[PDB]
Ligand binder design. Structure first.
Ligand code: ADP
Ligand code: ADP
Lengths: 809, 809
């Protein structure tokens, strides 16, 4: 326990501060949301691998630093662990250099007790691989297959591959911080992992950070109020990095007397204005920017985050100017372990990477943007998600004084057309390219802030599919849909803001969109309060939404009260889907009130899998009689029995009824309803379709059911009847109906266990020039060899129809 | 759970019927006797391999079919298993064709979800390898040693070897149906198996089957009564296959008006008469029989169960005649999977195999029967157990009209001599050939039904050893022993019919057998009711049984009452053995009553290990005095102490006593009985032998014991005394007796721990021309190197004796 105490004390001094203010002081709690969560037990469960997902600047880099100092005081994991090893991927040089040297280099200059005594018990070491996205070089998916020898690997790729696969040291605890875009590489290597998402700051947390940052509270409230006054900056301060930048810029200009919350349109504006405040006291510089942007170019082109002294002089800098750049945090990143250089944050290097593409040494901007645009997704050059974003933002001539007139409009205008061309290229890309997602493009599109450009750029969006996670994700999407005049089908994806104070802003966009026709909100956890504000927006005049799908939503009975209102007011809804909702007979009782109103004109309606009984049939029958606009009504999967169908059918036998479709799949059925169904078929005269499946229809019921179908003036075109208990003894009646009735088009009898004699009873009746012309479904039916070939030859005899049996898949 | 439901439904339709009547209707319970049993739990215990033993036609083939349909409804093994695979060994072509293709071919034509998703978890698949006896080709004991690769084996022998050994798929559940003759191949491959024997129908079950078969119950009782009237057919209807054949033949002739239960002598008669009813409506045919018998010949010669279209035309058939053969079940076996052909049952193919050997294309009957008779047991050509049986039966010119006069008597007469010669060849075979067992020959001999032929054929049976299992096994043996006039020693083996209604028929045979002398009923579970009927038969005059052995039988005290009766009546018993029976002092009290009767003359008597005490010694002493015929009495292993011996000896010291032998091995003994034993030795004058061993004889007892032996007029010839606690201090007295008494012949002192000085005390006394001439046992005694060689040289000096010490084994 000698060196164990020394190592534990050694970590305390190194990580006391982040390279000034105590880390124990300014640190605040982050949203440790467990992706399918106490800071105590990331490793309580026998899962021995944890991965952290977080966007750039969300605080992954220093979350581990707080975790390791918090360990060093014994407050976190004092029992299962007494050794912690920090693996900074930024400093890692993995191109055939490193051995297990990671262990000696971390502890102390060169002691080797732990290299032998500590490696013995594997439950004593975990590895904190910070920033796997910040890996440098070409990381092939598979390098160094055979790797088990302990002390000698000598290959950086082997070390990372083996340690992740837990082959170098079996039973090894891991906790790695990865950017969410990098999970594609992880999925090749992860084996039974645990995924945790890292969010940012809350409104209360933002106020706490400002108090913990501003020493003089007299202006802290004034600065916070100025920050709180802005609506875009405040919601952009969920990322802690932005809070640091706005605080530094305000405090840097505090000696000058300026503010920051005026040019807070997008991410480019706040960083460019920071660079304004980063250079307004300071200032040649563009060449120094050229010296570093090109250094930041090949630093992402060839993946060189760290900067050498020779590289510093290679592009051409001044040590005093570098120190001037150091002293007030341009990059200010000099490693204490050895004399190297780095940028302050990842977005700053990528911000200057886009600066090179707009200034006017390895890839020219105009010609090599196109190869970059197709190199955008390739991990070989890292990920350039922010590279284009700042490039997209910067061309909009941000209102900063000396960030407009030192760059050239000739390239920027050419860039605008190239970016506009690229958006269409990605939009028309049929293949499901994961990295240039529609949401990611909207992030760049929101960064435009140009009204006419986004109008023409987004006009290449016929179908919009959006998944949302954060509050900022709502505003970026809101700015797009508010001026998309060519959108036809739209959808939303929620995974978290469902309160009416948040979804109202986005939902208000839909009501004011003329081109919008379809809304797909299915498979979401949108609750009743969220549903209530949706109906408020739908009542707005001019809402051209026609068809909405609300399947699998968390809707309950009390939501139907609002839906009855929009039907009684809006006449644009034509198709409404409420399948898979836990609304009882009371919900239909409220819903049927709105449908009975003569103002509404609804044609289609889905109530599949809704918790319903025979009681709702009485209420729904009234609508079926008076609602002239109701044509199709798929009410299958419900628990209503034969009693409910009798009530529904007795009102559906009116010759003036408009019910042209009806589905009763898997609903409790017997042979009694066949008599009622027979009566409506001969009297309705326009029941074009009728779907039955999975029922318990009486074996004798078909005899009663066909009694009504044999009536001349019936126009049933499609009949589906599967999984019903049938026997070959009644198969004769099926043949009689098939030959007699000419209205039928396609009839399917799926997996209905009937004798092979009845199948051959159909062979001649089809050969007798019958009236079944479209399809005949007999799938999931097994016959012998001599029976199977008999149906095959009839296919060629009658090419006008297509018999559907299942000898294959 | 998509394809799992489809597969489960797929099995239901395929196996609903056995290629007409519902399998759910006519199926009835079979005797699922567990060989060392609910249909619920064959696989409850962690044993992961089950093998089923059953004779041909007992129902192994369709027992699995019922099991798999019963599974398909979820009634059997719904939890541990959801996938069942049927491996029909008849259809298996194992000569370097098959891959894992067994899995795709069974499910559906060609889907491959289960080939990848289902093979993952081995606790999801079991294999139903039906009829391992029906394997075709040369099955070597060891083919394909290395076999672990999953998807590619390509060798049929490798697949069967690996799957049985559970190497292709570790942790695999197996349930295989095998004919009992085939266990020799199984024992090479089985690893921790579970064996279950399958019996047939009961009398009540036979009645139930007739009711379930005959639609019109008016004649079902009449047909059953006609069946029940026959005594051989009814007991032959324990096999379900025979029930099917007799029912079909009666129903086939029901349109004609004939019966079946008149030519029911043997298995050949019922099948030949079935073939009569199989051809009386039909009928050229012999050539068609020649076309199929030769096809059935090379189908067992080269092991080709399945018949090809080319093979059908190769021998020469007619498709209409084949269809005529199909339509009323000659073989009627066309596979639904593919257009092949097969025989209806295994015995039918082997019945026609013997038909070729009696008609007049690959093995001539007369010359190649002899090679067949030595190829009878070789598994290379399958097993020909039924081939000879029908051949043995058919030569007896069965009373069928057109089954006598189309065949040639010239070959049949030559066959008779060859079969008669073969029986002697197998009878004189000293080696323990397992397959041509004595019981199996009697099965063929019973099928003769020829009085004079079986007389001369069985005259080559000096010793008869029979093991019986079923009721039919009793009648086949009964028909043999009833006319065996040269039997000397006979034995029975029971493993199940012990009720007096069954064993009486066989036991009545023994009483009427003149040549019979010895009966060995030892090591059986023959109870008192079975013992009671045995004594009833023994009282029959003319019973020439002299010596009976009844060791390890389940006899109790109440059986001795019957045994006392046969002794008081029959004067032929000379040797009676009752060793290892749980009969108390009361049993001897009843037994001694019969022995005291002057009519009985019993010489030898064994009461070893019987639960006895000193009380029985008083009763047994009276017999020892009055029973003049009693000479030897081995009453060792009993719990009687020294007190009992005193009572027994005090009556045994009479000079007129005839007790020439007496054994008291392991009975509780002390030094007190030596005085009584000394008194009898000097007075009895004819106690030739006296055996002692494992006692607690007093160390000083030998001094008292030798006191009587030193008397001149004593004629003790053999004395055995082992395991008695002895010391070298008394070893001097042993030497004095050895030199003095001239009556002793062989004296053994086994493992009696005495000093090496006493052994050398005997070295000189033997060298002094002593009177010990036959043997001197000193086994289980350990001496040093210089002591061991001293006894070795004395062996060559005196070749007239053989010292018995144990330096080796
Ligand atoms: N919990 C926190 N409290 C205060 N500031 C934070 C916190 N987390 C991150 N930061 C700010 O983020 C900056 C560093 O971000 P970093 O963790 O390096 O981002 P990344 O994880 O993407 O590399 C620091 O300047 C720091 O001020
Ligand atoms: N439980 C049963 N009930 C009725 N018949 C049976 C039963 N078991 C077997 N059978 C009869 O046996 C015949 C098939 O025998 P099989 O099982 O093929 O014999 P093996 O198992 O020796 O191949 C069928 O014709 C059937 O009538």
């Amino acid at each position: 326990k000698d060196y164990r105490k020394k190592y534990r004390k050694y970590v305390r001094s190194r990580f006391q501060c982040i390279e000034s203010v105590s880390l124990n002081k300014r640190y605040t709690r982050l949203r440790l949301i467990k992706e399918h969560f106490d800071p105590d037990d990331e490793h309580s469960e026998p899962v021995h691998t944890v991965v952290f997902q977080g966007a750039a600047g969300i605080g992954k880099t220093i979350l581990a630093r707080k975790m390791m100092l918090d360990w060093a005081s014994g407050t976190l994991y004092q029992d299962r662990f007494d050794y912690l090893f920090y693996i900074h991927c930024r400093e890692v040089s993995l191109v055939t250099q490193r051995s297990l040297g990671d262990l000696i280099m971390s502890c102390c200059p060169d002691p080797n007790p732990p290299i032998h005594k500590i490696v013995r018990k594997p439950s004593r070491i975990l590895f904190l691989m910070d920033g796997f996205d910040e890996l440098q070089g070409a990381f092939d998916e598979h390098i160094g297959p055979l790797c088990t020898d302990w002390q000698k690997a000598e290959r950086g790729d082997i070390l990372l591959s083996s340690l992740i696969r837990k082959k170098l040291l079996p039973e090894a605890s891991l906790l790695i911080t990865t950017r969410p875009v990098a999970l594609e590489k992880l999925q090749h290597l992860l084996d039974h992992p645990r995924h945790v998402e890292i969010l940012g700051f809350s409104e209360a947390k933002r106020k706490e950070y400002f108090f913990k940052y501003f020493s003089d509270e007299a202006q802290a409230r004034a600065a916070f109020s100025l920050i709180q006054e802005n609506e875009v900056l405040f919601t952009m301060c969920f990322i802690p990095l932005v809070c640091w930048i706005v605080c530094t810029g305000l405090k840097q200009q505090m000696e000058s007397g300026k503010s920051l919350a005026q040019t807070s349109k997008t991410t480019t504006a706040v960083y460019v204005f920071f660079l304004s405040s980063l250079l307004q006291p300071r200032g040649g510089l563009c060449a120094h920017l050229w010296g570093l942007c090109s250094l930041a170019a090949d630093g992402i082109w060839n993946q060189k985050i760290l900067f050498e002294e020779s590289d510093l002089r290679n592009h051409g800098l001044q040590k005093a100017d570098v120190s001037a750049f150091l002293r007030m945090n341009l990059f200010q990143k000099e490693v204490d372990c050895e004399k190297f250089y780095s940028f302050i944050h990842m977005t700053f290097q990528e911000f200057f990477a886009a600066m090179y593409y707009l200034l006017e040494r390895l890839k020219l901007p105009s010609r090599d943007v196109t190869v970059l645009l197709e190199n955008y997704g390739k991990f070989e050059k890292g990920y350039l998600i922010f590279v284009v974003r700042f490039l997209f933002g910067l061309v909009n001539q941000e209102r900063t004084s000396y960030l407009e007139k030192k760059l050239s409009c000739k390239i920027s205008q050419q860039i605008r057309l190239e970016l506009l061309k690229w958006i269409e290229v990605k939009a028309k890309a049929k293949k499901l390219q994961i990295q240039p997602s529609q949401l990611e493009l909207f992030y760049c599109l929101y960064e435009m802030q140009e009204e006419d450009f986004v109008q023409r750029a987004m006009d290449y969006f016929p179908k919009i599919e959006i998944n949302l996670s954060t509050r900022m994700d709502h505003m970026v999407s809101s700015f797009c849909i508010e001026n998309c005049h060519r959108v036809e089908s739209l959808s939303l994806g929620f995974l978290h803001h469902l309160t009416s104070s948040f979804c109202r802003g986005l939902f208000s966009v839909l009501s004011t969109s003329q081109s919008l026709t379809e809304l797909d909100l299915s498979d979401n956890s949108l609750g009743d309060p969220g549903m209530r504000v949706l109906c408020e927006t739908l009542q707005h005049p001019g809402c051209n939404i026609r068809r909405l799908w609300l399947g699998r939503c968390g809707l309950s009975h009390e939501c139907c009260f609002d839906i009855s209102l929009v039907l009684s007011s809006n006449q644009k809804l034509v198709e409404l889907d409420l399948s898979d909702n836990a609304l009882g007979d009371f919900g239909i009782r409220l819903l049927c009130v709105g449908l009975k109103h003569l103002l509404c004109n609804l044609k289609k309606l889905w109530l599949v899998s809704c918790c319903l009984t025979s009681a709702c049939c009485q209420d729904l029958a009234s609508v079926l009689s008076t609602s002239h606009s109701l044509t199709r009504l798929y009410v299958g999967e419900n628990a209503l029995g034969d009693s409910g169908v009798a009530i529904l059918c007795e009102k559906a036998k009116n010759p003036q009824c408009n019910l042209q479709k009806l589905g009763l799949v898997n609903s409790g059925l017997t042979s009694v309803c066949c008599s009622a169904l027979s009566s409506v078929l001969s009297t309705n005269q326009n029941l074009t379709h009728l779907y039955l499946r999975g029922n318990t229809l009486g074996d004798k019921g078909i005899k009663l059911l066909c009694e009504g179908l044999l009536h001349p003036d019936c126009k049933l075109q499609v009949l589906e009847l599967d999984n019903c208990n049938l026997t070959s003894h009644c198969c004769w009646d099926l043949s009689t109906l098939l030959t007699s009735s000419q209205s039928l088009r396609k009839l399917s009898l799926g997996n209905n266990d009937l004798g092979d004699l009845g199948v051959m009873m159909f062979c001649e009746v089809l050969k007798q020039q019958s009236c079944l012309l479209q399809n005949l479904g007999l799938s999931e039916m097994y016959f012998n060899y001599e029976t199977k070939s008999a149906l095959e030859t009839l296919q060629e005899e009658k090419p006008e129809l297509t018999v559907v049996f299942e000898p294959s898949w």
